[PDB]
């Protein structure tokens, strides 16, 4: 009955579950997860051969997220490992499979950094998101 | 009738029943789902 | 007609492989009005109430958050039960998200279908950890 | 129609009372078509196979020769099953001949007689000591 | 007098099917004075110690506890040896617990049982992965 | 103010050069309240609890015993985080003890020391292989 | 000072060392290792795509060794595992690298079976040899 | 002068000696043998 | 002038990598009139004799039969010594042919070639296991 | 000339003195062809 | 008359050489009235009683199935006794079938026949593995 | 020119005699430029760094405060080195203050004085207790 507060591991696992369920169902609402100074890169590839750079905000990450069509995405998580970091933040490492538009499942590797909003207790926003398919890099 | 150990002809061949299904899964649909994924 | 041992062993293999690979597809193992515990504990520190109905089983399965749920089967015992059912007692170890392996037991009661022969739907699925009680 | 939880709890109490008060009449709990295994090992190390039939069950009980077995039922969970049957999963500690307690996992399957109300027989009995298989 | 290639193929298909299906009954292939050496379990797992007899062979196999070990056979070489024995060297991809496919070599030396014609038992069984050596 | 990408590249090159060269002085990259989780080290090798502090980090690294761990870095991504911190996630191929080349991900969260400008220490270090999952 | 008899592990290791040292230095003399009933395959590949068959004698072992024309071979044994078998014989499993004429190092897998001649104690001959490159199999 | 932990500028660079050779092996010849076969 | 700590560490890395990969090329570490005592108890129950010259060193090295020799360096200590030499004491674990790891020490005395910069040849190489003595 | 049992003297070392060889090679025959280089 | 120390040492080396190479011919060492015990155990756990007579001794030796016994002799002490006989005290390690070495304690007493000079037979042989009686 | 084996053996005996008989004058075994380490641990757990200079060696010895050091020297191996110098490698057990024995590993480097015939001084001293590092 002792309420306590969520551990970093449980927080990270809950965030992974919430993030990928929302992405699979309503990708357009994904932009609500991030913040004003939230850096985001999601398996990009520019017209040069090197991985794409990262966005550093809200409007432009929403624009990127619309740029990727992100329809009927199926995700299969093989590894979520979370730990505590500076300012009660949680650093999360995720590995698994992702498939967009019902294509073949491709191996993805990702790193989240969640930070507290401060004013509201037990509220976290995605300060950092680093996602790469290990097929356009390996 | 070439069997090995304490085996006679019949046991493990019947112990491998490919026709058995569970739930609504089509025969072998679960297997294929696991393989190459 | 196959051996109850045969049915139990094959179901154990299929269930504990599909649990690792695609846990979201586990709901297709059960049928209408099937009991599925697997809670271990609840908010009040008590064995979770059974959830009935495929929708409820799927919801609870998704809530459990199985990621790379490895299973270490120590023993599987299958016996014939009423109405040409099979009762399976599976004991072993389980590790979710590559965590520490915990001892577990699981009781499966698989009922058949008068329509399709050699087809079984899990009527009862009871799961418990050793540490949560001892 | 009493609750399956109460049915399983009452049966667990009576069975573990007769395990030591009077193991001679333990076979009266089992029906003609009934499976029984109580955690045995063979020379090769595989767990002992179950026996069938009330008389074979009685003979196996006598071979086990329970002498003042002491029970501590850590957990018992009973649920509904085919033909209003009950499946009971019990976890606890059993000590034989006043020796050290041993952890055990068990599954009972009780099927109604169909002759008189609220009467059950042990269709299935799967007992397993933890240390023997883990 | 069955062909050495024929008996090698029959044994390889039988052994791997049983290994994928019923890991518990894997010991049945062996007997007395049979050497079983595999990948090895220890504090570090590097020291892979041979074990003898059905007792130790079954214990080691259950310790390794293959679960849905999928095997894709790439090559089989069977040849004749002393006492009309058969030596089998096998290449394949073994994926245990739904891990990745890993190359391996399994070398069997099979001896005739003597009593029943066209009956063989695994006298020597040397298993060695690829990644752990190279 | 140094660029987050620049500091990420500098740290990755320095850390892996030191790791290949002098594994003993690897702990010098960390300090107090620094979490270090890396691979799996247990009887089964699956669970590896993270250790905190320079003492425990050095002990864990020495228990790992990196011997000529050749690393081929395929991708480094470095970004900004709280307290003007830097988070760096790297993809590469790691082969220790002259073993096979294996894929991995290492994620560092670096915190500024606060005293000296352009000074950082490894506050969080999460390492994972590719074969351990999937 | 107790003389004793060599263990199967030591016998197999010594045989592997002798086999590959002789082969690297004087391949033409390798024919002496075998016996009248010595089945032998060595990384064969006929003009069909399937691995070659076996040879079971001295004269054909010789001509086969001259057929593969071993010159200045560089072998690198990565694993040798020996065990006792029927009639005091020893079954040996070998894995490693083999390069002929200074070509690329090829992954090789081999299985020897050594049997006692009988007349002179502690004397063996190679009853069985199964050698294959992983490249021509995998 | 961007260093990490407690190092100053370049002690690790000094600890990384590429010109050091042992025996008659050419500089980096050993690394070549161990990495590329 | 490189520090003895650096020269010793580099030599330890190169030696215990080349020992694993290409043992036949170890003879080129040494020079003329160099002592190589690596070995153990002889027939007369005495420490292994010293072999001098690349001829005897290579012969002894090939006699040792270093197959897949795995080494875990617990400690390396390097100290400057006479004639601008380096004395290195390396203690750790050694396993030949993937066998059980045995505790060992090795003492290297490295002398610098007469007319070249940063070039060392092992003048003395003394090796001893722990079990053979205690 | 110490002897034990009914065993002849020296026949013990005769029986246990055979060295481990291979093929039809004499003891140590393989080595000298091998040891022709550095 | 040679030294009893040398006599006992030579007998020890010959006895273990024959115990390893040709265990069938070990009986030839024993004589009509000789005692043998080689560290057996019975159901009750008392050490096995010694046997007598050359034929019964040979039978027991063959039943012990000595297969490639590897023995390291830590200490031999031979001394004079009645009728110029020699008592030999042996401490060492012995392992059959290439298992791990087991520490053993042994006492021989040899007696001259009086027919030909410098001829001895094993009057009594007592052998005990340390781990079985300590 | 006495043999290096005898030189090293005599020095070992004298050094371990003065280690307990009179540790005050142990500093006399070293010169102006001598390295000394005797198995110490720091706060971080790395082995203690060696000291240099005769006066610093004397200080370190006094800090170690050897009181009646009982030493059992299991193995000594002395061999030639640069300009008639000798390297000694010693393994054994050492216990100070009449406490429990501890396994130790040591290397001495003795360089001739060049002014007095058969004069040696400890240029280098490396001492490591097994428990602290392994």
The count of C-alpha atoms lying within 13 angstroms of the C-alpha of D36, restricted to the half-sphere facing its C-beta, is 24
Helix (H) or strand (E) holding I21: helix I4-21
Q: How many CB atoms lie within 10 A of CB D27?
A: 20
Distance from CA of D28 to the nearest CA of E (A): 33
Contact F20, F70 (CB under 8 A): yes
Alpha-carbon span K80 to K3, nearest angstrom: 9
Structure tokens that stand for J12 in this block: 């013990």
Which parts of chain D fold into alpha helices (H)? 4-21, 54-64, 130-133
Contact F72, F16 (CB under 8 A): no
D96: Cα separation from own chain's centroid: 15
Interface of C with B in 28-47 (CB under 8 A): 28-31
Contact E79, G128 (CB under 8 A): yes
- Whether residue H13 lies within 8 A of chain G, CB to CB, comes out as no
| Closest CA in chain I for residue J35 | I59
Structure tokens that stand for A4 in this block: 């306590």
- DSSP-assigned states of every residue in L70-108: EEEEEEEEEEE-GGG-EEEEEEEEEESTT---EEEEEEE
Q: Which of G3, G14, G29 sits opposite J16 (nearest CB)?
A: G3
> Which positions in chain F touch I74 (Cβ < 8 Å)?
62, 65
Beta bridge partners of E80: E86
E25: Cα separation from own chain's centroid: 13
Structure tokens that stand for A130 in this block: 């680093």
Beta bridge partners of K89: K77, K107
Strands (DSSP E) contained in L1-134 are 30-38, 51-52, 70-80, 86-95, 102-112, 120-129
Structure tokens that stand for I51 in this block: 């072999």
| Closest CA in chain H for residue I7 | H20
Contact E27, E57 (CB under 8 A): yes
Burial B22-33, CB ≥16 within 10 A → b, else e: bbebeeeebbee
Beta bridge partners of J18: none
Alpha-carbon span E108 to E123, nearest angstrom: 8
Alpha-carbon span D71 to D19, nearest angstrom: 9
What's the start-to-end Cα distance of chain K, in Å?
A: 39
- L115 burial (CB, 10 Å; 0-12 / 13-18 / 19+) is exposed
> Beta strand F85-95 with F102-112: parallel, antiparallel or unpaired?
antiparallel
Three-class DSSP category at B35: coil
Contact A128, A110 (CB under 8 A): no
Distance from CA of E1 to the nearest CA of C (A): 34
Structure tokens that stand for A14 in this block: 């809950």
Instruction: Determine whether the interchain pair H22/I11 forms a contact, defined as Cβ–Cβ distance below 8 Å.
Output: yes
Q: Using the Cα atoms of residue A38, residue A41, residue A42 and residue A44 in order, give the sign of their dihedral.
A: positive
- DSSP-assigned states of every residue in D80-125: EETTTEEEEEEEEEEESTT---EEEEEEEEEEE-SSSTT-EEEEEE
Instruction: Determine whether the interchain pair G1/K13 forms a contact, defined as Cβ–Cβ distance below 8 Å.
Output: yes
User: Ramachandran region of residue A70, left (φ > 0), alpha (ψ -120 to 50) or beta?
Assistant: left
Q: Which of K79, K87, K97 is nearest to K20 (CA)?
A: K97
A78, B23, E37, L39, L104 from L50: Cα distances, Å: 48, 71, 47, 9, 16
Place of tokens 């410098």: K118
Other chains touching F, judged by 3 or more CB pairs under 8 Å: A, C, E, H, I, L
Three-class DSSP category at B7: coil
Mutate which: D33, D34, D35, D101, vs C, most C CBs within 10 A: D35
What's the start-to-end Cα distance of chain A, in Å?
A: 48
K20: Cα separation from own chain's centroid: 12
Contact K123, K85 (CB under 8 A): yes
Structure tokens that stand for D32 in this block: 């003609």
Alpha-carbon span D66 to D86, nearest angstrom: 26
Contact F6, F105 (CB under 8 A): no
Q: Which of D51, D49, D23 is nearest to D36 (CA)?
A: D51
DSSP E28: G
List of residues 6+ apart from A123 with CB closer than 8 A: A116, A117
Experimental method: cryo-EM
Give ∠ CA D78-D80-D81 in degrees, rounded to 5: 120
Distance from CA of B5 to the nearest CA of C (A): 20
> Which positions in chain H touch I31 (Cβ < 8 Å)?
23
Q: Which of E36, E4, E31 is nearest to E106 (CA)?
A: E36
Q: Using the Cα atoms of residue D59, residue D60, residue D66 and residue D72 in order, give the sign of their dihedral.
A: negative
A76, C16, C66, E97, K74 from C25: Cα distances, Å: 12, 12, 12, 18, 65
Alpha-carbon span F109 to F88, nearest angstrom: 6
Q: Which of F102, F40, F46, F35 is nearest to F71 (CA)?
A: F102
- DSSP-assigned states of every residue in C3-15: -HHHHHHHHHHHH
Q: Which of C40, C16, C41 is nearest to C29 (CA)?
A: C16
| Closest CA in chain D for residue E28 | D44
> Which positions in chain E touch F45 (Cβ < 8 Å)?
45
> Which positions in chain H touch I119 (Cβ < 8 Å)?
21-22
Instruction: Determine whether the interchain pair K11/J3 forms a contact, defined as Cβ–Cβ distance below 8 Å.
Output: no
How many residues are listed for chain A in this entry? Answer: 138
List of residues 6+ apart from L48 with CB closer than 8 A: L37, L38, L39, L40, L41, L42
Helix (H) or strand (E) holding G109: strand G106-116
Place of tokens 């298992």: K99
Helix (H) or strand (E) holding C16: helix C4-21
Alpha-carbon span C111 to I104, nearest angstrom: 62
Contact G127, G39 (CB under 8 A): yes
CB pairs under 8 A between F and H: 38
Instruction: Determine whether the interchain pair F54/L44 forms a contact, defined as Cβ–Cβ distance below 8 Å.
Output: yes
């Amino acid at each position: 009955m002792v309420m306590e507060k969520p551990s970093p591991l449980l927080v990270g696992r809950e965030f992974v579950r919430q993030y990928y369920t929302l992405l699979n169902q309503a990708p357009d609402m994904l932009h609500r997860f991030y913040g004003k100074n939230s850096s985001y890169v999601h398996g990009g590839l520019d017209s040069n051969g090197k991985p794409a750079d990262a966005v550093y905000g809200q409007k432009e990450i929403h624009r990127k997220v619309m740029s990727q069509n992100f329809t009927n995405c199926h995700t299969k998580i093989r590894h979520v490992d979370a730990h505590a970091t500076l300012n009660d933040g949680v650093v999360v490492q995720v590995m698994g499979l992702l498939s967009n538009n019902n294509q073949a499942l491709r191996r993805f590797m990702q790193t989240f950094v969640l930070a507290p909003e401060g004013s509201v207790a037990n509220k976290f926003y995605v300060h950092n998101d680093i996602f790469r398919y290990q097929d356009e890099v390996f | 009738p070439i069997t090995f150990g304490d085996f006679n002809d019949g046991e493990i061949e019947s112990l491998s029943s490919e026709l058995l299904t569970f739930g609504d899964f089509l025969p072998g649909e679960v297997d294929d789902l696991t393989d190459s994924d």
